[PDB]
Every structure is written in structure tokens, then in C-alpha cells.
Design a protein around this ligand. Sequence first.
Ligand SMILES: O=C(Nc1ccc(Cl)cc1)O/N=C1\N[C@H](CO)[C@@H](O)[C@H](O)[C@H]1O
Ligand SMILES: [Zn+2]
Length: 1016
Amino acid sequence: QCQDVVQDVPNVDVQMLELYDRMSFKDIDGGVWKQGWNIKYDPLKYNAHHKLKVFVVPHSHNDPGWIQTFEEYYQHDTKHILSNALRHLHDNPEMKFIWAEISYFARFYHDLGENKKLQMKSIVKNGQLEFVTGGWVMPDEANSHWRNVLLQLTEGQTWLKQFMNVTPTASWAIDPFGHSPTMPYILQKSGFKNMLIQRTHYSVKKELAQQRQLEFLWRQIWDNKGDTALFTHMMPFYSYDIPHTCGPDPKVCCQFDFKRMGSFGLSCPWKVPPRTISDQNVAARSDLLVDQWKKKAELYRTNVLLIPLGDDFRFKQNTEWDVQRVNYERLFEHINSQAHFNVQAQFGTLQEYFDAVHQAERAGQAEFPTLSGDFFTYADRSDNYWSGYYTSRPYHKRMDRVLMHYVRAAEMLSAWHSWDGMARIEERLEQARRELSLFQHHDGITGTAKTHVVVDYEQRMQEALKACQMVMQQSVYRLLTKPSIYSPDFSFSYFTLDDSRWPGSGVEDSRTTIILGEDILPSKHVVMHNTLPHWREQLVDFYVSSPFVSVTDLANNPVEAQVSPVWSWHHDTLTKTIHPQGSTTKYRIIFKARVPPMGLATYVLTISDSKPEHTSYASNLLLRKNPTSLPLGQYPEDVKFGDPREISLRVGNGPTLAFSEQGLLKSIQLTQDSPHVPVHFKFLKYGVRSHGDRSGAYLFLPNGPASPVELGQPVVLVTKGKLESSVSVGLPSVVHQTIMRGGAPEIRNLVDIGSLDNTEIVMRLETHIDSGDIFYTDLNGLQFIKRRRLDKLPLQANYYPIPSGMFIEDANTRLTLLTGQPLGGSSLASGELEIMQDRRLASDDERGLGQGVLDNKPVLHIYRLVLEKVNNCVRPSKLHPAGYLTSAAHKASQSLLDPLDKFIFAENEWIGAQGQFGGDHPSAREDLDVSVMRRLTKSSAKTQRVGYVLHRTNLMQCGTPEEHTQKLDVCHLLPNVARCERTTLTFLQNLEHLDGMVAPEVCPMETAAYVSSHSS
Ligand SMILES: O=C(Nc1ccc(Cl)cc1)O/N=C1\N[C@H](CO)[C@@H](O)[C@H](O)[C@H]1O
Ligand SMILES: [Zn+2]
């Protein structure tokens, strides 16, 4: 019933991995079309009964932050563009305009009076102003998580449906730096019919153009049937600006950008300015322009041609609207009335273009090719590959993933109840969704904005995290307090969030110590939340004021715990070492929390005067020449010292890890019977070219392969505990930590590139896996795609986005690295994986930013490292373009991206406390997630509505027998269900009324949305 996503290789006309394997990437001068060739056309192709239909589509690219902040641009540019659009379109009925960025449109619309709102609605209604995509932003496609792509699309489309009563079905993505099939995946499931893309490698544009394969049905890589296909138009030329949109010769096209005549400070760099169209030159100018259009049309299969007309922050001035509109109207009048051109040209919208193309297709003009794959890594010219922004500003890349989780958790926790308006829950959740959605912009998460703009995004995300914390903690208080005892005040802090990994140890001393004492306060409630729809156990840790602490559950059952010191690291400028210091005033308590599906569990920490029965203490070993003592206050075990040596550790039944004398992993033995498999961590640095093109925020232009970071004799700290052990080493620019809790290790890097200008720090893994030239990287946390290292491409082209994970494998062994933040990475030799940590660039890379990247700050990167035997796994065949995680790797990814949330009760006594919430929630199969749970109605609605997005991944079968699991029917998670509907993923259209009000679970690799309606 479900499609098999593993075992059937789809047959498509263009499969991008295969196309890459065959294609030439030579950068040859193609003439006026520098990256193409001199286009020829048969003049007789067009005649009285077969005319070329041209749609000139005015647009204005508005970045929600880049060289100015969102609000700076809105005040300086965008408010003027939209005010002038409203005026000019209202006054000129044949003029059209498309608008993409709903963040700005909403910012504008809410400063409009009623009269202007009605005027605006009128030009939308009549089709003059058309929204394209309708997302809050035009998102990055490399670093963004699919959940956030959906978040921002939903934010924008919900706004448009509520205020404009429109839902776009055509998407416009002219600026993201390379393109992902995650986009058509999400769009096709959200009602879209067509999409347009632009920034693809110039060699791919040439290859596809030659074959008229620039318009294609883009299906997912595993889709044998084609049910996921979305019609896609790829623009053929170097840019979306007017010189690169009218046709192949920018010297000619520039003459048709009427903003470039002088009075607007713009000109044509090809040295021929535009001239005003008049009766004395209209025929000559028309001839020039039609010949460009006819050349562009040769690259496409129908007689319908798309001519975008715009550029960045265009259509700002009244006089600009006039100069473009009047000159084009003069051209259209001449061209259309002169039969010898056989052209009918008009202003159009994007949807108008696609409608006409499909009309032509239905008329049998053309059949379109099918395509799968992705469009990374982009290069716009020569060897200038845009793999730098897979890593740029990694602090904020990590912050994105943190906020992604806290928005999900806040929406889910608060969804269980309806809230009085005074609680301000909807206000806070809307703020958080909008700040996270804004950051998905292709100059946000990409790390390609100016320094002060990055600070604006950071501040906005900090406010969003605060809003999430507020909603979460109010929700926990409500869900775990006896209903007749619950006495909320909506401005009060019942709990504080405790997060061990953001900002992280050594980044910020943000964490609250639980203060207990025999003479003051014996015990403290803590609460864990599990956003995933299965029972979950995870070790959690808290800081406490004494090492003599016992843990119990809320039936007072003892829970095994481990206490460890609180270690921090310091670049000790006196002794010239990077070395740890232990706290003498607080300690870490660690225990396994077990939490219901989408639920909560309460535990209690209690002080004692001596070592508790069920709490053990870690040993600590400091390996270094020239040791000095490390006192630890009340901690009962003295630190031990040793000269650097190889060491091995094993927690529980789990793998045994060996470490070099520099405290870096060297090997992993999976079981007592198995071999010690070589897996070596190494840190290296890339530099920058002294002559020739410089790396910057966008571009990665290394001066050769990376060189090893010289480690000296680093200080190594070993902590050995029953529940958790770790090895940490202070290296130059990186405190590197491997943590073992009895399965796949966790890796944490506290990365501080300091003042190392023109350096990029990379973490590499070296193994004996014979992967050859193959490796796998994920796309938007949604799917893994097969990559092939090509030596016909330079090193920076073989870097790909690693938004959530990467792996290499051979017949028997796989090594998967899961990430808690998007970064760039590759496999540059058989058996290697590498992932960039940070980059500090003192030069601009000539893409408009006008600065390097010199605002680095310490960031705590997190990973899981999974080594597995895979000879028993049922994998795709050699020619299949996808890869799939194992269950262990998928759970490891979930542990990074959606960990348990931890709450500390903020006062001395919690009256009416309960031990659990969600004990009765079904525990769904491990491949299924409830990606979104969101209440859609305010508390006054008679009919309450809750939306759910359900995602089922596909995990490899490797012989672990499948346990029975419960069916999850989201429509029955809340009481009094009156209806259950399947909807588009934005919740905006009902697709199916569901029998028995039961929401079916979805197939592997499918995502479905459901809305349950409840009588209230
Ligand atoms: O690169 C530019 N530079 C530029 C922009 C406006 C003006 Cl008036 C003059 C120059 O244009 N636009 C853009 N440039 C960047 C890529 O090169 C990209 O990060 C940004 O999002 C994209 O919109
Ligand atoms: Zn842009």
C-alpha cells in the first residue's frame, strides 16, 4: 500500500547524482552569455497562428535583514515599495506585481488604515498583486530544518488566508544559495502546483538548457511512482536582475532596466545605458528586446515565456514605477501590434505564467522531463562554490536548532488546554514562531548578514526563547497540579528551564544551582518533558549545592544517580595551558528520567548528610605532565593524576572506547567479542588564498587541504562514572569532549576560534571503512542523499550542507555522525568524515556583504557518533540515490534535536503536585513523530481545533525484531472530538473528512497533517 522507498530505483529523465557523474564542469567562455553559448533560433518558428506569449513579471527582492536589519529596511525601503505598489497598481489596472516575503507585508499591513486595507484587498482580489510562496521569508534551503521551513511557510500562509483570503500555489525562490528537494516535498503537500528556482550551478544551467530540461517535474529521490512531483521552472541565467532575465546578453537586457539612466544612481556596467522609448526608436528597441526574448524562449519547450522584471528593493520610488511601466507599455504596444514579431507581450504574474504553460502542455505542445536530486553545492562562477555559508556564524546556527525545539515544546505543552486571553499564550507563541521564522531567511541562518544584523537576529531569538520558557513553565504548572488546587498567576515563574547544552558549559554560566540543605530545604521537585510520541528514557543532569543528594520518583521509589564535579575550562594565561577547574560549591547530579509520550514526569532531589544508598560518585583523572591539585569542595573522591597515556572506557553493557594520549578517540569496540575498530578524531585548519579569490561568509576557497592543528601536550580530563563517563581535552581553539552513557557516544566541542584570522577549524574522523568516494549527507533533517566525491571538482565543491547528519559505509560497517547544528562537511578520502566547526575570515568575498566574518563567539557544538555493523541491513542498491538511518542513529539524532526538557520548581513548596502527565498517551512506533501539535483556535471558539503534523521516517531493517507498538490516532488525543480531517501541512485546506474521526498513520517518508475539532 505504501511505496517501498528502499528497493526500487526510480527511473527519471535527470537524476542529479548521475548527471554530475557524466557532466563536464569546464568553465568555458560562451560569449555574451558567458556561461552558455550563442543561442540560435529559427525566425519562422513563430507566425500568425503560433505566437510567442511573453509574461513580464515585475518583482522586488526584499531581504528581511542582510546589510540592514529587518526594521531598518522596512523603514528605509520596504514601506515605500509597498505604499507605492498599492498606489501604482490601484491607478494602473494592467500593471502587475508579485510579492514573496510575508514578514514585511504583515509589518506594512498593520500600519495601514482601513481605506488602504480595502484598496489593498482590491488589488489582490483582481489579480494585480499576487503573493508568491507566501512564506514569512524566502528561506535558506541548505541549513534550515524542514520543520522550520514548514513553520515559516505556515506563518506566512496563515496570515495571507486570514487577512487577504488567498493561498498561493506557485513558489518563487530566486535567491537561496542552492536548492533542496525538501522544498517541493513540503510545497506539494501544502497545495502547491508550481515552483521556480534560480541559484543553481552555472554548469547545470548550461547542461539542462542544451536539452530544454529547465522545466521539469521534480520528484523525491526515492519516489518510484511520481506522486511527489512538483512542476519546477529553473531560470537559465546568472542572476535574477533585469540584465540577466530578458535574454542571454546582459549588455542588451541592461538597456531595458529603465532605472539605470542616471537619476537613480544606477547605471549599466556593460557601458550602454537604457534609452527612453519614443516613437523615434520604438521599432529599433522592440527589435532588440524581442530578439533577446526569442533566444531565451529557445531554452524552453512551450510558446509561453517568463520574463521577470526586478531586482533588490526595486519599485521603491514613484518615479521608478513610472519609468519602468511607461517604457514597457510603449514596447508592448509596438510589439503586439506589429504582426512580424509574432509576439504577444504583457505584464503578468507568476501564476499567470504557469497557468499558460500548463494550458500549452494540455494542448500537447510539450512533455516535460522528470528529475530527482538536489542543487548543491552552488557555484555562480569559476571555482567560487558557496559552501562557506554552511558554517558561517555557527553560534546562531546552533541557536536555530535550540529555538526550533523550544517552539515545538511550547506549542505542544500549551496545546493540551485552552488558555484565557490574560495568560498571553497566543501572543508569546506568535512572537516565538515569527522570530524563528524570520531567522530562516537566506541571510539569517546562513550567517551571511552584517555584524549588527546578526546581533538583531540573536536578540530576537533570545526573546523568542524567553517567550517559549514562559509558556512551557505555565503549562507544566497547569498539567501537573491537581485541578481543584491549581491557582495560576500568569506573570509568575513556577519553574525555570535548565538546559545543559545551550548556551553550554564555557559559553555562559546560565544554569541555576538547586540549593538544598539540612537546615533549610531538604528537597526539590524537577520535571522532565518529552515532546516525542513514545516513552523515552534519557540521562538528565542538574547542578546541586551538595554532593549528598538522592533522587526519587513521585511514588518515592529510589532512582539510581551519579554525582560528578562541575568542570569548567580556562585558557590560563599565566601557565599557558588550557585546563580544567572544578567547582568547590556546586556539583552535578545525573540520573535516568523516564517520561511518557508527549508527557511529563516529576522527580525529587533530596539532600542527606552522608553518601546516599543509591547515588554513586565519579572518579576523575587528570592526565598531564606537571599536574597541580584540583580541590573539589565537598566532593568525596579526590582527583587522581597521571602522565599522558592511552586510556579505555566502557559504560554499562555498551561500547568500549579507546583514546590517544592526546585524549582523542582512536577506537571503538562494540561488544566484548568484537574488534577494536579504528575511529580517530583529528582537528585541522584550512586557510585562505593570498592571491586570487578570498573566502568570506559565502564562499569557501581554501588554500589547499587542511593542515593538522598542532596539539602540544594537551591536558586530558577523564571522568569515570557508573552512569556517565567522559574524556575532555583542551586543544587550541577547541575543548573537545567525548561522553559515554552506555550507547553511541556524545561529542561536545566548545569552539573558540579567538583571533585566528583567515582560519577555518575542521573536525575529521578517520576510519578503515572502505567507502571509496561515496558518502551521505542529510537534506533539511528530512532525508539522506547519496554524495560522490568528484576529483573533477575542487575541494570546496565536495563540501555539502550537514543540517543533521552524515555517514560513510562499506559492506560491513557504517559510521554516522549526527549534529545538533547545521555545519558544512564532506568525506575527502575513503573512510573519512569531516565537519567544519567555525571560520574566521578577514576579507569580503565579493557577494555584497562588504565585510568578512570577524564576530565569532564561543559555541558549544553537539554530536552523536554511531558506529554500526551493517552487513545484515537491507540497504538500497548501488544505483539508488538515497540512504537511510538505522534506528540507533535516528534515536541519536532525536536526542540532539529534541532532548527532554528540564524544569526546576522555583519555590520551596509545590502544593498539589502530580507525578506524571501523559501516562495514557499511546507510544507510537519509533519511526513516527508528531512534528507539530498546535492549538489553532483561541479560547472563545465554540469549536476548538488542534493541528498535528505527523512524519514517518524510513529506518533500515537490520534484523531487530519489531515489537508491537500502539497506534497513534492524534484526533483522539483531546476529549470531545467532533470531527477529524486530513489537511494540507499548513492546516489551511481540508483534504479528507475522516471516518470514525480516526487519523491514519502515514507511510515511510511521508508527512501528513490532521486537524481535530472539539466541542467546547
Ligand atoms: O548582492 C547583492 N548586492 C546588492 C544588493 C542590493 C543593492 Cl541596492 C546593491 C547590491 O544583492 N543581493 C543579494 N546578495 C547576496 C548574495 O550575493 C545575498 O546574501 C542577498 O540575500 C541577496 O539579496
Ligand atoms: Zn536575498
